[PDB]
Design a binder for this molecule. Structure first.
Ligand code: 7KP
Length: 504
């Protein structure tokens, strides 16, 4: 993966509402800022219950958004990342409807997992209770195979039936997806829900040896087609390290909340610890298309004795801090859970989670860019967007607080703001200075300061982070200082908003 900043966006929520418009925005307004882009699911349909992640036909671009030729066109100027939903598919797919019609006579019967698929001999209460769950309840629902009531395996909504990733038909399906991506010049694949894609009795059916075997298989097929695979998993952080040593790339989901903690308390010891131990084959983010993950720093939710990177009280305090900084906006969008340790994500734009403090936000982005890994910027964050309460009240979908629809006009108006221009200049600095292609190091004081240094063949840079200097949501004191050396000698910026860095 190129070591350049990428954009995460919906095709229809950035510009006029099409892949062509999104491409035009990227090329005309973010040249040199975002040299790659992760296009969120744009298949048929993109506007269902789960904003494109519940496709009926994963292989056809929604004709309202564009075509695969548009993806091919975009690939000529940007590296493209796309999702591959490998664990399940719509119960409204033609295949599953065929299984409902013909049952075991269906050509696609072996393609879908049932309880009997995994437990041909019966299952114990321990067998079923031990399955790792993103949603409450057992992963089964009732469907009728031509007349016969069957329990279909469903890791998520009952409308998303899980496929047998080990069957010939299922694998054929996955490889059809891979063949289209490969045919439209996509570079990177984000394997959605891949950790659940392998089922085996007596195990958690989540990131087991079988799951890793599946991932490696998909990897070989990808490289055979020129597609690199990215793994997405929200889990207890130690499991994240473990998984990261076994795959090409994972997300760094701990950093966003770690930076919220640092900027709200001034403590940097957790950030230094995570820096020391984190997996470096990472994609770094602050905001995503989902809510802010708190489980990723995370007392283990199956065994609360394995403590996270901060005490549980600091986790509760983090959630409450987002609530306070947003003056209750996130409370309206987050479902209450009777205890903040039970929470999975907190629905708020990152900029809003910081109380819209420009200095804090630009500092967070700087840290993100200085840690090993490819940085991604979510489009809302690319425009320093606030919580969209109108859309939330319209749809009652919590996550929509962080999924504002930006018209071209709105984009151009927000591009005049100093913090946005500071982020653009910062991403240019991160994309153009070759120091970041060299070697990484860092120093720490005890709890006040931490300095990340990259040294390269023709440049060097050190970012010093000291949140202790600028406490307060209304604070305007810079909390990040930057020194770097390029063609023009040594340079220093003590305010990344007022004095964004420019490489010679
Ligand atoms: O399609 C369903 C969703 O898939 C992805 O989200 C995931 C993908 C995944 O592999 C695991 C999870 C985990 C949920 C979860 C985890 C731990 C827990 O304790 C409770 C719940 C979420 C997309 O990004 C999201 O937009 C989409 O809606």
């Amino acid at each position: 993966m190129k070591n350049k900043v990428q954009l995460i966006t919906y095709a229809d929520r950035l510009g006029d509402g099409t892949i062509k418009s999104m491409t035009d925005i990227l090329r005309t307004r973010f040249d040199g800022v975002y040299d790659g882009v992760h296009i969120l699911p744009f298949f048929t349909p993109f506007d269902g219950a789960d904003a494109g992640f519940d496709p009926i036909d994963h292989t056809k671009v929604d004709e309202r958004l564009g075509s695969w030729d548009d993806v091919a066109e975009l690939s000529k100027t940007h590296n493209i990342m796309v999702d591959a939903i490998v664990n399940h598919m719509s119960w409204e797919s033609k295949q599953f409807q065929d299984v409902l019609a013909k049952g075991e006579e269906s050509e696609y019967y072996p393609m879908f997992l049932t309880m009997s698929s995994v437990f041909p001999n019966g299952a114990t209460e321990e067998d079923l209770a031990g399955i790792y769950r993103p949603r409450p309840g057992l992963p089964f629902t009732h469907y009728k195979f031509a007349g016969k009531t069957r329990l279909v395996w469903v890791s998520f909504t009952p409308q998303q039936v899980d496929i047998d990733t080990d069957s010939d038909k299922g694998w054929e399906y996955l490889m059809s997806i891979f063949d289209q991506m490969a045919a439209s010049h996509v570079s990177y694949i984000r394997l959605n829900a891949v950790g659940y894609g392998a089922k085996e009795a007596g195990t958690s059916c989540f990131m087991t040896p079988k799951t890793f075997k599946l991932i490696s298989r998909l990897r070989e097929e990808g490289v055979k087609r020129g597609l690199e695979i990215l793994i997405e998993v929200h889990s207890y952080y130690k499991k994240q390290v473990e998984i990261a040593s076994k795959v090409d790339r994972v997300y760094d989901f701990a950093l966003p909340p770690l930076l919220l903690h640092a900027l709200s308390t001034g403590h940097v010891e957790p950030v230094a610890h995570w820096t020391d131990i984190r997996p470096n084959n990472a994609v770094t983010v602050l905001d995503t298309h989902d809510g802010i993950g708190v489980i990723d720093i995370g007392s283990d939710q199956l065994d609360r004795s394995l403590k996270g990177l901060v005490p549980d009280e600091d986790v509760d305090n983090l959630v409450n801090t987002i609530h306070a900084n947003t003056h209750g906006e996130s409370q309206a969008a987050t479902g209450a859970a009777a205890s903040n340790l039970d929470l999975y994500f907190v629905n708020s734009t990152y900029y809003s989670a910081l109380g819209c403090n420009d200095q804090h936000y630009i500092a967070a982005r700087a840290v993100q860019f200085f840690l090993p890994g490819v940085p991604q910027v979510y489009y809302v964050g690319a425009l320093a967007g606030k919580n969209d309460m109108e859309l939330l009240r319209k749809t009652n979908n919590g996550r929509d607080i962080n999924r504002h629809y930006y018209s071209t006009a709105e984009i151009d108006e927000n591009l005049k703001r100093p913090v946005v221009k500071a982020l653009n200049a910062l991403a240019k600095f991160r994309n153009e200075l070759d120091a970041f292609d060299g070697t990484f190091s860092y120093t720490t004081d005890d709890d006040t300061s931490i300095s990340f240094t990259w040294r390269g063949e023709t440049s060097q840079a050190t970012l010093t982070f000291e949140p202790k200097r600028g406490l307060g949501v209304d604070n305007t004191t810079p909390v990040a200082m930057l020194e770097w050396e390029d063609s023009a000698g040594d340079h220093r910026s003590d305010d990344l908003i007022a004095n964004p860095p420019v490489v010679a």
